[PDB]
């Protein structure tokens, strides 16, 4: 199996699913495309229709319209499917779960990506590498891992990186608090445990998960003009939900 559970696959069949590919947005924190073609948009339903997508290539992704279904989609990717011209972004809703989240074409005309690493390049060149598959030459002179960065997507253009710290609007992307959202309350250095992360959610209920899983997304709610998952990540009283449900 090794099914990846937040890909919401199920029951019978899919020993493997169609396995993803080596190529940015790592195995476990991907949400690769195929699943989308068949299992998300739904028109294409068989493998036959997928197959059909491909033998008539079709499917299209910002940046490269992308050829690979096995290619991970993950945080913020922008799909346009020109037959109907429909766009979605990749993003969690609360209760941790990933949606393909339809987004404005114009909103669907940028994205944000965390820096995973910040390097020299050969010649007082610097180059930064993002936690999702960018290497970018000559970035801010002092950018750093864990600061995210706005990208044009339509173009090759950084629109930002934001001189990070404490108290900044965060989407918690994993550990326990996957799909939790919370402005950073703070991170204490916890060196080599990594900083651990005090988070407070839209309630103003505060919660912790380790600093690694923390996607700054802005200040003042969204700095980003990106989609905000309904509820915006507290996690609460199921019970009531049940209740709520039953009208």
């Amino acid at each position: 199996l090794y099914a990846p559970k937040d890909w919401m696959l199920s029951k019978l069949t899919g020993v493997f699913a169609p396995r993803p590919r080596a190529g940015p947005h790592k195995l476990r924190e991907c949400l690769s495309l195929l699943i989308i073609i068949r299992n998300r948009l739904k028109y294409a339903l068989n493998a036959l229709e997928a197959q059909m997508i491909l033998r008539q290539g079709l499917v299209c992704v910002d940046g490269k319209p992308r050829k690979d279904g096995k290619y991970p989609a993950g945080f913020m990717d922008v799909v346009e499917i020109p037959k109907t011209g429909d766009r979605f972004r990749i993003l969690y809703d609360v209760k941790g779960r990933f949606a393909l989240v339809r987004v404005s074409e114009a909103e669907s005309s940028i994205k944000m990506m965390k820096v995973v690493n910040v390097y020299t390049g050969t010649g007082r060149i610097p180059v930064a590498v993002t936690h999702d598959g960018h290497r970018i030459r000559y970035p801010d002179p002092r950018t750093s891992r864990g600061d995210t960065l706005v990208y044009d997507v339509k173009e090759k253009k950084v629109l930002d990186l934001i001189k990070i710290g404490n108290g900044k609007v965060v989407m918690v992307t994993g550990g326990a608090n996957r799909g939790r959202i919370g402005e950073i309350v703070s991170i204490e250095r916890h060196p080599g445990a990594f900083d651990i992360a005090r988070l407070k959610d839209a309630s103003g209920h505060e919660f912790a998960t380790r600093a690694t899983n923390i996607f700054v997304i802005g200040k003042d709610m969204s700095s980003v003009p990106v989609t905000l998952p309904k509820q915006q990540g507290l996690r609460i009283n199921v019970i009531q939900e049940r209740e709520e449900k039953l009208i």
């Binding site: 199996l1 019978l12 020993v15 199921v238 019970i239 049940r242």
Partner: protein, 186 residues
């Protein structure tokens, strides 16, 4: 390699010839006019299981979740279904319960109770040669339990000759009219 979640469920009941045990069980079985002790076992199991759950649940340090969740769930269906009651709501009867409560909510029996049929047996057999609607199917399975609005539903297979604007070659056994038309036929 790869799987399936099938499984195996239910448990039989320990150690036979206990005169009372045999007696008590039977009597109950006598009320319903049955077809196996297995049906009892089934009930015991279930009965037990929730009763088990009950055993667990109450001791839970008060102000803690499950009791709320499950209590509501159990309450609302059972109660809902026409099993538990509003006053059986402090979970105290839930600890209690009786097998008959269950039997009583074998939909067949409720029917007979409902009136319909001349006994629970008469009720089995009816339903079974395909009669009286509630669901998608009559109740093909009188094995079933109730659920409080089926309560209403309980009526003909309009479908059945028994509610048809016409009948069918059966029960009534139109057939004879076919036999007539073929046999009698001038």
């Amino acid at each position: 390699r790869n799987y399936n979640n099938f499984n195996r469920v239910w448990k039989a009941p320990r150690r036979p010839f206990e005169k009372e045990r045999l007696d008590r069980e039977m009597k109950l079985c006598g009320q319903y006019g049955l077809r196996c002790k297995r049906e009892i076992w089934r009930v015991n199991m279930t009965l037990s299981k929730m009763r088990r759950t009950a055993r667990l649940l109450l001791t839970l340090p008060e102000n803690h979740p499950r009791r709320l969740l499950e209590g509501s769930a159990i309450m609302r269906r059972c109660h809902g279904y026409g099993f538990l009651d509003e006053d059986k709501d402090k979970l105290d009867y839930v600890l209690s319960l009786t097998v008959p409560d269950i039997l009583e909510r074998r939909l067949q029996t409720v029917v007979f109770k409902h009136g319909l049929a001349k006994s629970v047996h008469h009720s089995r057999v009816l339903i079974q040669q395909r009669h009286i609607a509630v669901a998608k199917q009559i109740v093909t399975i009188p094995s079933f339990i109730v659920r409080v609005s089926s309560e209403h539903h309980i009526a003909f297979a309009d479908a059945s000759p028994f509610g048809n604007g016409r009948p069918g070659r059966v029960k009534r056994v139109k057939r004879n009219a076919a036999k007539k038309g073929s046999g009698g036929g001038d």
